[PDB]
Structures are given as C-alpha cells and as structure tokens.
Amino acid sequence: SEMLEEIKRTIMQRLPERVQVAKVEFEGPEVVIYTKNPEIITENGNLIRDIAKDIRKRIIIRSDRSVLMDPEKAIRKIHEIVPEEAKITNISFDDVTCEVIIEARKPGLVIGKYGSTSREIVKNTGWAPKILRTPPISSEIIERIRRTLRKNSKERKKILQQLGNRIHQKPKYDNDWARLTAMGGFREVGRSCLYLQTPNSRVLLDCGVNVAGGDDKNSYPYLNVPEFTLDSLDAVIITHAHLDHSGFLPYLYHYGYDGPVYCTAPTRDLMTLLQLDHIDIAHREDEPLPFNVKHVKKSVKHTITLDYGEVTDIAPDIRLTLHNAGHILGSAMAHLHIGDGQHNMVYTGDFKYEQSRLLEAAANRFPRIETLVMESTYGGHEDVQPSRNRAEKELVKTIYSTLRRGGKILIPVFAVGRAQELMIVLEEYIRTGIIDEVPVYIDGMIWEANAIHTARPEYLSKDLRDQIFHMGHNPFISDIFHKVNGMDERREIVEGEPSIILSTSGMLTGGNSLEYFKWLCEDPDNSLVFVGYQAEGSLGRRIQKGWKEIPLKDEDDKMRVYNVRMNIKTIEGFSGHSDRRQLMEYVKRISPKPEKILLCHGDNYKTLDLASSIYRTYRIETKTPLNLETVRIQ
Amino acid sequence: VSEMLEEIKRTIMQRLPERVQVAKVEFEGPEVVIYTKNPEIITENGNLIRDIAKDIRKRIIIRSDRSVLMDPEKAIRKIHEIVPEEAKITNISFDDVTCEVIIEARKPGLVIGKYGSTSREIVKNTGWAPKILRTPPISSEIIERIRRTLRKNSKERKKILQQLGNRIHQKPKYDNDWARLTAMGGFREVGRSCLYLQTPNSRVLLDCGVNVAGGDDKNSYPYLNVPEFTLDSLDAVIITHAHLDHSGFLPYLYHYGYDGPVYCTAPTRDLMTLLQLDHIDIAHREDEPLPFNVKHVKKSVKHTITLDYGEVTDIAPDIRLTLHNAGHILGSAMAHLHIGDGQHNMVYTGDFKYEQSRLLEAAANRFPRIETLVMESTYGGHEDVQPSRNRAEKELVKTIYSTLRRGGKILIPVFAVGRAQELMIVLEEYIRTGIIDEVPVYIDGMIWEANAIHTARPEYLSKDLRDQIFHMGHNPFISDIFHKVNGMDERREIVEGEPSIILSTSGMLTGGNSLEYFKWLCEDPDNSLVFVGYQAEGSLGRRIQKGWKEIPLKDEDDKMRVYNVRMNIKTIEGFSGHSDRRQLMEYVKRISPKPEKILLCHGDNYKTLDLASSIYRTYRIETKTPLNLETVRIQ
Ligand SMILES: [K+]
Ligand SMILES: [K+]
Ligand SMILES: [Zn+2]
Ligand SMILES: [Zn+2]
Ligand SMILES: [Zn+2]
Ligand SMILES: [Zn+2]
Ligand SMILES: [Zn+2]
C-alpha cells in the first residue's frame, strides 16, 4: 500500500511529461502505465524497458479509457485501413488489457510492412491490436470462456488490483528456507499435488484427482495436512490440463479459495473442457459431485494465462517461468526463482523428452537450478519403450488383422492425450493407403479438444503448425474422421461395417468407451488397443492385466457378466510420458546440473528403482518422499 | 460438561460398593480421581479399584474428599501425637491438589510403623494421605522454591488439571490413518533438539532446546515458524532431560501463549528450572536480550506434570506415554509413545548412555510394541569409539599428578549437571584412597545446587550409589574435599593461591564463571585444561580442543584483548554422557522389539550419515537422516 507509492514515484521521475500518464496500476504480476496519448505506445518503450530492468518489474503501457474509441466507431476505422485485402473474420474487444482482437485470413496485411498498419490502428482508436490468424474451426469452449471474461470486466479488474497489491509488497520475513510437501501423486499415479512453502509464500504445484473410481481417501489430495490452510495459499500452478493434475482445482474454489491460478492458455481451455465433462459424467450416472458449473467459472476468472518463457512475479519472493513440457497441448514445466535465486527449483509435471508429431520435445535449458522434481511414470529398468517407427508398424499390423477379420478396433483415449497423436498418424496412414480406407469415429470430446489445438497453433510443434497453416494439410478436418455424439448413433456404429473407434475415458473407466466396450467385447473378431498408460485400479489396467470376466450395467441397469473374447493388444512406444531411457538421458542433459532430485508421479516400485539408478549412475542425491512427507530445498 | 466423561463415571460407580462413600469422580490430567468421604478406604490396597482400572484401561487414584480433610494446623497437632518424637520430623508440607501430607524425618520407618500401622492411623485421624520421605542431607533451594510455587497456585492448578483431563479422555475425533514427525531442531546438528509429532487428532512436542552455542537467532532457536506448528493446537510437550539443548526454549512457548502441559521426570523438572534460571541470570548479568523471563519459567512449572519411569499415562485421546531411563543425566528419559491402535508406536531416546555409570543405571532397551525408533547420534562415525573408563580414569590421574606437581591448576569446564556429577564421584574415591595428592577441590555454586537435587532424588540414582549414600552414609557430595564458591572475590583468591582442582559452570566455554577462570590461567604453561563432555561446533571449547591457541575477547575493563595459550590441553575420551560408536551400534542390536524404521537426530552432519550408512549395511533396517525442516511419515 505504501511501498508501492515509491515504485510509482520512481516511474514518474524517470518519465517525460510528453508521455501523458493517466494513472499507474499494479495489476497482477505486472505494472500498468495508462496514457492519454496512444501514440506513446507506438514509440519504442526502450526508456520503459530501461525503467523495467531498473526496478526489476514487468511494465505494460495501455491507453486510458478516456482515449479509447467506442467499439461501434472503432470497427469502421479498421475496415478503412486494411482494407478488404487481409479479409477479416472477427473483431473483439477487451476492456481490461485495452486490446482489439483481430482475426483475419492473412494477418500479415493487418500488421503492415514495418508494423505500420497496426501503428495506424493504435494511433486512430487507442486500442492495442492483437493480430491473430483465423481458426479453421471455432471452439465452443473458448467462445464460452470469452463470454465469461467479457461479462465479468469490473470484477476481474478488482481481482487483478488486489492480487497485484499482494504481489509487489516487500517480503515480510527473510528467506532462510524453502520446503516442499507432498500432498498427492507420490509413490502413486493420481492426485498430483505439491506444496511449496517459504516464510513468506504458500504455493500449490498441480492440484489433481485420482480418476480411478475408488475411495475418497485415495482420490483427493491431502488438504487435511496441518501445514496447508486455504487462506494462506498465494497461488496455484497447473502444469497441464489432465485431471491427474488439475481436477481438484474447482474444489478449491468451492471451499472458498480466492487467489490466482497460473497456466498456459491451452491448459486453461482444455482444463475447463475436462472439468465440465466431469460434471456431465456425474449428472449422467446420478453421482453426487461437489463442484457445480459456477466453481469452474470462478476458476476461470482467477486464471492468469502465461506464455512459455514469460517470466512472472507471482509472490514477493517468487518468480515463475513456464517451459514447454511437450506432453499435451500447452503442457508446461514450472521453474521457480526463489528469493535471491541461489536455490531455484523446477517441477516437470507430466513430460516427454522426444519430439512427437504434435509437440516439440520438453525443454532442458533453464536459469540456475538447485532442485529438480520429475515424474517417474515409466521409471524402472523394465520400462524401455520401442522406437516410434516400431510402435507404428505394430499398430498397422493389428488394425489390418482386425479389418481382415471383419471387426472393429476400439481405442479408448482421454479427450486430449494420445488421441491427437493417434489422429495425425491414422489420417496419414489411411490417406496414403498404408491402412485400408475405413471410417474413423471420434467422440465429441476429442473433436472439441482438437478445435482448441488448431486454435492455439503456437503451442503445437513447428513442423505440424507449418503443415497446417502454410501447407494447408490439416489432419483434423479430414473426411476420414466422423464426429460422434449420442448413444443412438453409436448403436449403428458397432452394428455397422469394420471401422476404427476413438472414445473417451482413456483407461476404460465409465464414459463412452465403456459402452462401446460392452457392445464389442464378446466378439473375437473385434480388438481393443491400448496406447496410453493404464493406471492401477482402473478397469483399463484390469482388462490389460488379463481380466476377462467383467460385471456391468445392462441395456437398462441390470448387472450382467461379460465374457471378453475380443483381442487385447497393448502398443508400447506411444505414451505422453518419456520412457525409462529418456528419463535417464534427461538427467544427463540439463541446463544447470541439479544437486537434488525428487521423484513423483510414479508407481511405488518404479520410483525407488529410478532413484537408486539415478544416484549410482550420476551420484546425485534423489529423494523419494511418501505422500505426507516434506523435503527441504533451502 | 461432556457425555463421554459421564459414561465412564457411571461404569466406575456401578462397580463400586456402598462402603466406598464416593463423593465425586474427577478427571484430573492423565488420571481419573475418586474422592471418598471415608479415608479408611485409602488404606486398603484397592484390589477392586485396580480391577476397574484395567477393565477401562484408565488410571484410577483414590483420595479423601475436601469434606473429610482436617485443617492443616489441626492435622500437624494430631501427627506429633503419633510418632511421638523418636522419628525426628524435619518439615511437614501439604498438597490441596493430591490431598497429601508430606513428611520428612530422620527415621521414616517410625512414621510408617510396622505393618504400615502408624501411617494408616494418620489417614484415619486426619483424612490426609501420608507421603513419607527421609530428610535429605542437603536441602535444595530450587526444590523448595518450586514447592512454594505449587502451593500458592493450587487454586489455579486444580482448574488446569480439570480442563486438561477433560480434553484428554475424549473419544478420538478422526481415524488414525497416518502419523508424521517434523524435525524442528537438532537434526544434522547438536543444538536445538525439538521434534513435532502429529496425528490427525494430536500435536506433541518432543524436546524444545536452545543451541547454547550463542550466535544468530536463526541458529539458536528451533523453527516454530513452520506452517504446521500452532501453539493453540499443541496438546503436550515432552522433555527428556534437563539439558538446555533439549529444554532451554520451553519458557518461550509459555511466553507466547501456550496453555498446555509439560511431561517429564521429577528431577528433570527440577534441574530444568535451575539451568533455565541460570541462563536468564547470565543474559541479564551480561546485557543481552532473551525472549523469556522468570515470569515464564514459573508458568512452565505450574503446567508441568512429573512422571516416574515406566508410568503409563494418557497424554491425548490417541496417545499413551511412558518414560524409560535414558541413563544420560539424573532423570534423563526416553519416550515411548503408544499411538492409536498401537500398531505404529515410536520411541524417542533423547540423549542416552547405553552403559552403567557410577552415577546412573544403563539406558533402557526393553520396550513394548514399536515400529519407529528415533535415536541420538552425537558419536556416530567409526572414528568415535571411546576407550573404557578404567583407562580414562588412569589417563586422568596421570594428567593430574603431572600438572599438580608442576605448580599448576587443573581446570575442568562442566555444565551444572552432567559430567560434573560423575567426575565428583570418581574424584572423591581417588583422593580418599590417596591415589591423588590431597588438595582442596573448588566447585561453582551451580554444581553444588545441582548436587542438592541429586541427593533429594535417590530413587533415580544407580542402585549401587543409592545404597552407598542412603544405607551406608558414604555420601560423596559432602566430603570436606569440596568447597562451594560464591562471589568473585573467592575466585581471585584461588588463582593467586596455591595449585589445586577447579570445576566451573557452562561446559563448552560460553561464558559465566567458566570463562572467568580461563581468563586467568591459560597463559601459564604450568596449568592445563581437560575436556570430558562433547564439544559442539559453535564454541570456544571446540576451537581450543582442535589445536587453536589465539583468541579475541574482553578484559576487566571490557577491553578487546589477545590471549595466547601455552598450557596443556588434554581431552579425556571415554566419559561423555553419550554412548559412543560401539554402544550406539550395540543398542540397535539389543533393542527389545526390532524397529522397522529408524530416524537419527542430535548428531553432527557427517557422523549422522556415517552411522545411518552403517546401520542399514549391518542390520538392513531403513534409516532416515532428515534435514532440519523435513517431515518423515511414521504410519
Ligand atoms: K489444514
Ligand atoms: K507457525
Ligand atoms: Zn499425470
Ligand atoms: Zn498428463
Ligand atoms: Zn510457422
Ligand atoms: Zn544431554
Ligand atoms: Zn543433547
């Protein structure tokens, strides 16, 4: 409140009057300078950056509300100076960031050669143009998120006002120490949740849920831990959108959390999609779910989207940076700069240290690092996956076999994960004629997630991105695929001609895939293909492990015993997690060599296995904490 | 007040005869107290009482109701009637809380009377319960001061127990799915021993010490600023032994609003308060801040509950505590915590010597069900094997007779309680025999006052020594050999005087009287210094022990002055109150039930890891060596 004034005074004393400052706000992680002279934005903020580096802050310049053009009139002036050439799809406005969102067929000519066209836009309207390429298909989810954000301007500004007020304070105490407390997904794969404590700050790294249909004592993170109180909590960071890592977030907002959430733009989008489906599933089966739609909305309002590499002040003593995890669209690793920096840490979350058809390999270059916290899903020597090539041949073989038998191939997948990777490869192999021309069916859920993909292309692999937006080969539109919604429709699918099915609930735990499974499991011609990791507990793993006598609800709700006779095939070398050797290589090749390693998100016996392996082959101390244990970082 | 309580009361009384004229049943601390209107029932060995006690697994105490207790003044009159004078009484005290009359006499057997006849009659006549004691050879200023405090706060103390008892005997709120221990001090170090046990229902501190090695606050005090620690949720504090590195921070808690109990042995409590008070006096005599005062030490006493070795006591709805002899110091204990269903119990050792000393019995190794064991590791690491004390004794005499005939004094710096006691015994015997030249040995007032407490708590001393003082009258703490030193003028007269033996307060040279004698005798080659206890990192003792000779400190007129050491520095290994490398190892072998997990504390970093490395390699038991803010899960 008072230390902030000194920050404001420093700005004004370093700035010319010509820059007509209206007010200086502390909005969230950043400092905002509002000017009554829009042309100032246009000029080089080099003097601005000189100030930013001087006070060690991020500084944004925007136009004051007074010098902003009425959106009505603002649109005319746009069409005036483009004009039709770069055919414009849509124009939107953002009352908070003072940006005009412009999506067009050819974004280049919205900008102008030396960025001169957009220069004219700001100079004439006062709006910062966000030049964006037209999405080949709109994503209902994003449209909704935008409506939420739009209609809640006033409220969002105050949240940012207050959040920023907490963030740029001088720390209350010295930074003697730092600690990490496990709260989930340790010596298990499930409720990934990690709790960082400073004498000043309390942050939660991931906040997930165990999807496996079991006890509450096994499905949720340990909030009942003495150290964790909700009021003390300064921020939640969400690596990627999988419910393993994000599913418990809406519970927090139900229990009265009032703070920020940080993640990549895709993460926020996918997250919302997955959580919303999680409501539809419970409403479908008549199961008491705690969080309503409202709690997802609150989550969205308090979410702060971050680009990869974008350094962010989230607490008086904590800078956050997100680096590409390359596991799922928008998946990220958290690098945390703590205090004086001498003891920084990195959390991986789920990651893959290999370029996929969809994503760029996980990052491995960072600022100074003391401690590394990595997943160990496929840890333990026995977990070397086969080469991408071999993995691909294997699939083709299975499908051809089924197709020749005249059957269908069911591949159960999460709405986002292996699904997209699978779609790229299948599209290609069919179109090329490596696989026989056969319809590939896809759950609305996956489809809707794909929409998000094409809409955040910057988060895809360069290779793929350029293939879509420069070469015009977009696999997700292909006539090969057919969108699926309604059990009514699905009935026809299973009764129809030999085909390939992608359906929701990655491990066969409820959802659509289960219903397909019911219909197809009793025919030896059909085959079930496993691609993702099958967690312990899940029916998927039970099936995989060889279980062939499964009891389920009937056409009505009658319990019926199902004698599985269909082919069960697991295809290794496709998972979103880096394999055993890749994990070990990731440690060999790091930015600064870490001095301590923690292992999480890993099956009990695989975690211990990797730990000794790492140490004996690299002589680096690795801790393998149990679920309620705490490790010191500083 | 509570329904769970009333239920117990009914079950108690429906199993009692009309003859037990029961006034009321109270829950007072860990125990259930039956007040009776018929004192003659106290007399009978409550065979039915103990039966009820085992059946409900609670501890039951019988007392006379305040109704049938005779006036204190009137009671005294009735007592002197029945001795009548032969067994010469020294002092008579009363305790409103326990309904107990305390009597110290020259001949206690005559106050009991054959067949307990006399004592029985005192109950019949006054309603008071006679606690009979022999009058100690020396009275303890500190023990008397405590007793006064307890008398003049009985009103409050009665209420304190009533609430505490009310909290303890409740049904556990949540299941006992998990248990965990947070290191808060004295881990990978020796300094602020403090340990935080937490269940879903209960929060207990094991030890609460101060790193006497006075430096930064961030290094001297335990880490209470850990998120998981609240003072409002803390159910109990357990103090193993009176040493400041285990007990010195306790008064801070009460300063900062702690309202709960402290558990320990009677001598521990007494010794505690002595060292705690001395620590306060030292700071104020040396113009230095300390975040607690006398006021707070008094509060600490008010809330203290003393226990005997092997006394099972309900601490929390899901915790039972038993203290076992640690053999380290007078009253030194290990803690056995029976948690929940008892499947995942733990033991904390504190400091301990797994060997019989002249002064104390060997550290207990026999316990009921255990899963986790937390032991000290001061002398971990293969290098830290100590030679037999028979050798240490011989090697000590050698040094003495050398320095003594050279025209020099022998300085031994010791904490008021510790090696001082042991040393005095072995010293007394050797001069009396004539193995040592007869020279006067000077003691600091502090060690003397500590001794007083030793002779007042006989039952905690080794069986041998207990027998030799209280049945043979060979009390070594009386020998004309020793001289109590108070004031500064006496100390100067020893330095200029003719050579002899010195014992001075503050073990490793922190300050106090210990630093005074040093700044008088170190520049003389004739003199020498002997280390007998452990030397912690942040001390001058540790520096002088490792070969360092030059130091900067203050003079008479508080002047920054140089001090050059020419004297002999001889360390006598094989006398510390900590069991050495061989004994620590042996302890793990002979431990009653084999633990399935071991945590190491109170050890030097490199030694801790060394030991742990060897524990696992030898016995293949998981050993954790947690850093100072880490948490280990027990269940
Ligand atoms: K809590
Ligand atoms: K605290
Ligand atoms: Zn995961
Ligand atoms: Zn994931
Ligand atoms: Zn490109
Ligand atoms: Zn000790
Ligand atoms: Zn100690």
Numbering used by the authors:
A (entry chain A): 3 to 636
B (entry chain B): 2 to 636
Give verbatim excerpts from the published study on this entry.
MTH1203, a β-CASP metallo-β-lactamase family nuclease from the archaeon Methanothermobacter thermautotrophicus, was identified as a putative nuclease that might contribute to RNA processing. In vitro nuclease activity assays demonstrated that MTH1203 is a zinc-dependent nuclease.
The MTH1203 protein has a tripartite architecture consisting of the two N-terminal KH domains (KHa and KHb), the central MBL domain and the C-terminal β-CASP domain. The two molecules found in the asymmetric unit are essentially identical and superpose with a root mean square deviation of 0.65 Å. Two zinc ions are observed in the active site which is situated at the bottom of a cleft in the MBL domain. The two zinc atoms are coordinated in an octahedral geometry by the bound phosphate and the conserved residues His242, His244, Asp246, and His247 from motif 2, His329 (motif 3), Asp352 (motif 4), His579 (motif B), and His603 (motif C) located in the MBL domain, similar to the active site structures of CPSF-73 and TTHA0252. However, this domain lacks the GXXG motif that is essential for RNA binding (Lin et al., 1997; Siomi et al., 1994), and the conformation of its helix-turn-helix structure, crucial for RNA binding, is different suggesting that the KHa domain does not bind RNA. Interestingly, the RNA-binding site of KHb is distant to the active site of the MBL domain, being separated by ∼42 Å with no significant positively charged regions observed on the molecular surface between the two domains.
